Every structure is written in C-alpha cells, then in structure tokens.
A paper describes a structure:
In the T119M structure, the longer Met119 side chain extends across the thyroxine-binding channel into a hydrophobic pocket surrounded by residues Leu17, Ala19, Leu110 and Val121. The distance between amide-N of residue 52 and Cα of Ser50 in the WT and T119M structures is 4.2 Å. In addition, the T119M monomers were calculated to be more stable than WT monomers by 1 kcal mol−1 (~5-fold increase in stability), a small but statistically significant effect. Finally, the coupling between TTR quaternary structure and the stability of the TTR fold suggested by the simulations indicates that the highly stable T119M-TTR tetramer reduces the probability of the CD strands unfolding. In contrast, the T119M mutation stabilises the dimer–dimer interface as well as TTR’s tertiary structure.
Human transthyretin (TTR) is a 55 kDa homotetrameric protein that transports thyroxine (T4) and retinol-binding protein (RBP) in the serum and cerebrospinal fluid. Tetramer dissociation is thought to be the rate-limiting step in amyloid formation.
Numbering used by the authors:
A (entry chain A), B (entry chain B), C (entry chain B), D (entry chain A): 10 to 125
The structure:
C-alpha cells in the first residue's frame, strides 16, 4: 500500500469516520489533476487509493474535507479543509502514511515515510 | 489589525524567521487572487497584512513556504508548503491569529479568533 | 520575565482563561517543591511567575489543570492534567515560553526559548 | 489489548524505535506504583503491557523517555520526558491507544478510546 490516510478526532477520542478525501497530482500544465478519492472507514483509515505502478513521481495534494465532518456533528469549524502537499517517489518508490488529528480550530498532520 | 500570522520552529524552539507568507482570496472565478504577502519578523510574526476595510467576508488561503525555510537549515522536509484555508465572517468584530508550528515531517496549525 | 505560560483552546479557537497553573522545582530529595502558581488571564497567559534571581538552573515541572477547564465547559476530557517537565540551563540569557494547545483527548505543547 | 502506546518521530518521518516507556498506577497511599514497562518496537508500538484482568479502574501515568531518544540522535531536546496522566476504566473496561508525536521542542499526544 503506497498511500494510506488516517484521520482522528481529538474532541471525541475516536477515529474520524466517513471523512471524504480527495487526492490530486500536479500535471505538466501545472493544474491539479484528480488522482483518487474515497472515504475513511470505521477505523479512520483509507486504503486502496492507488497502486505502486500508478503512483509515479510527482507533486501530490491530499485534501481532507474536515468542514463537512464537523458540521455533521453540530460544530461550526474554522477551516474549510485540511490540505497536505508533497513530492512523492522522487528517489524511488516509497510508502506514505498521512495522518491528521482534527479539532474544530486546529489540526496537526504527520507523514510517515518508509522504504519497502 | 484583523489578521496576524505566527510561525514557530519545533526543532530549534524558536520563532521561524524570514518565512515567506502569501495570502489569497477566493474570486468569483473560483480562482485564488493575490491579496497580501510578507516575510516573518525576528519574532516569527507577520503584521500589517490588511485593514478592517479591505478584509471583507470571504474564503481566504494563507500559504507558508515551509520548504524554503527547512532547506536554509540543511534539513530535508516533507511538505511543499503549509496551507490554511478558512472563511472570514462578520459576527461582531473579529481578529484572526493564524499560528503554525513547524517540524520537518509534521505541522500543526491553530486559529485564535477574538473580539475587541 | 524568564518564564511565561500560554494556554489555548482548540475547540473554541480562544485563549483558555482562568486555568490553574502550578510550577514545581525538583528538590535534592527527588521531590517536587511548590515554586509558583496562578491562573491564566483573559489572553490565556500567565506572567509574573518568577524573577531572574530566583530562576536558577534545575529541573522544573509546569502542571496545567486541564480537567477543571473542560468540566466548566461541559466536556468530558481524557487527561487529569497536562505536565511539562524540563531543565533550565544558563547558556547565555534565556527566556522560556511554554505554550499548550488543548483539546478534550489531545494536547500539544511547545517551548520557545529566546535570548535577550 | 487494553493499553497500547505508539511513538512517532516528526523530524525523521518515522516511528520512534527503542523508546523506553514506564507505566504507573496511583496507589491507595497516593504514591505512583510501577505497573508495566517496555520499549517500542521497529513499528514505534508497544504491545503487551497488561491484560484486561490486571488493568483495573484507576489513575495511570504513562511516561515516555523522550530525552534519551533525542540524545542518541545527537539532539539536545527541551523536555525531560513526556507524561500522559488519565483515569482508566471508570465506566467499565475500555481499550486505550496512547500516541505521541515527538519533536525536540514540542510534542503532541492523542488518546483513542474504544469500547470492545
């Protein structure tokens, strides 16, 4: 699994379930091209976004729709979404875990990068 | 001053000095128009970005060039930049402090919204 | 002022006001002696804890009563309190800012150490 | 697994390996009694600290020896250790995951609490 996203809720102490995630790749034109999307599971995780063959060198953006998450719990949050932008695989293929820790007015994001 | 940005370095326990910050406002196009920019001071802060008159309701993006900051220190970082996207609403008088705590593979951002 | 404490609420996007803070210094016993205390102001800050003369090298503990803060807001929190334990060293003149960002099931703490 | 600890390194983007963890339980005397200890694995995780039968209601402290971790990498960090203090199982047995995200001058901690 070359790309995995994990989302946690810091108000409830729980995984953040059914959060929409969109992944984009920067194209040769410098536009953001849609690459993959999905929703987190009951464990807060999103697996199966891509394969090693399709996940080439490039600049990628992971967009986490935090606003819809908090609104469905009755909270009006600060941010419109959380965005993570990074260069991937530029020294060969790697495995990436992108984690986000969500509060209404704050978020933290961490990347764990491992060499398979 | 309705909008202030503060950037901190979690590796060195210091303000993050001379970090470039770009602020964008969402246009009718759905495109991001330049709005304000500057470099953080010795205290890690950026003041003077805008005025009460010009800072109307809308969606704003604050982009922090974190990759250039780490490269100056000789540290290879994960993120291309840190982005904070939010709506400004007139709900009484509002001042916005956007803070970012930087590490090479992680960042935290917090918004403090207060009322004079 | 060699030591300042700042506490922020990530649920409400505000300073955390009237939070009790206790500071301890490590004794020869290996025991924690009361050193200073106070309640955070409307800005979430606590100033005036000590003086350059009394703040000698040592190991210090800063205890923030986060559980009482959340209970006042009607939120059931995870932690009994937040603790920050550190050594102070004379390595030139040092000022310490200890910041805590509070959520019900998470907190972040940062130290900014600067030199006048 | 009623209690699991996960430690990540925000400077290197990796699990924090071979970090010492000590767990204490507050005794009837109000002293901290040793409860369990171990070292994180190559995945940054520490499993097998306790069993459901032994993990009774109480106040627990998880102490993560961050200082030794950073010193072995050549960094002189701010904190002596990271401490997490919490009431456990007071409404029946729960499963607890305690995560810590480490930088030299900052750390974040999160708890995920699930009902088996």
């Amino acid at each position: 699994c070359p790309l995995m996203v994990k989302v946690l809720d810091a108000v409830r102490g729980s995984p953040a379930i059914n959060v929409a995630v969109h992944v984009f790749r920067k194209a040769a034109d410098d536009t953001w091209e849609p690459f993959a999307s999905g929703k987190t599971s009951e464990s807060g995780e999103l697996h199966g976004l891509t394969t090693e063959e399709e996940f080439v060198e490039g600049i990628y953006k992971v967009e986490i729709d935090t606003k819809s998450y908090w609104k469905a719990l009755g909270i009006s949050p600060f941010h419109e979404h959380a965005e993570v932008v990074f260069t991937a695989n530029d020294s060969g293929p790697r495995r990436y875990t992108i984690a986000a820790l969500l509060s209404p007015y704050s978020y933290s994001t961490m990347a764990v990068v491992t060499n398979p």
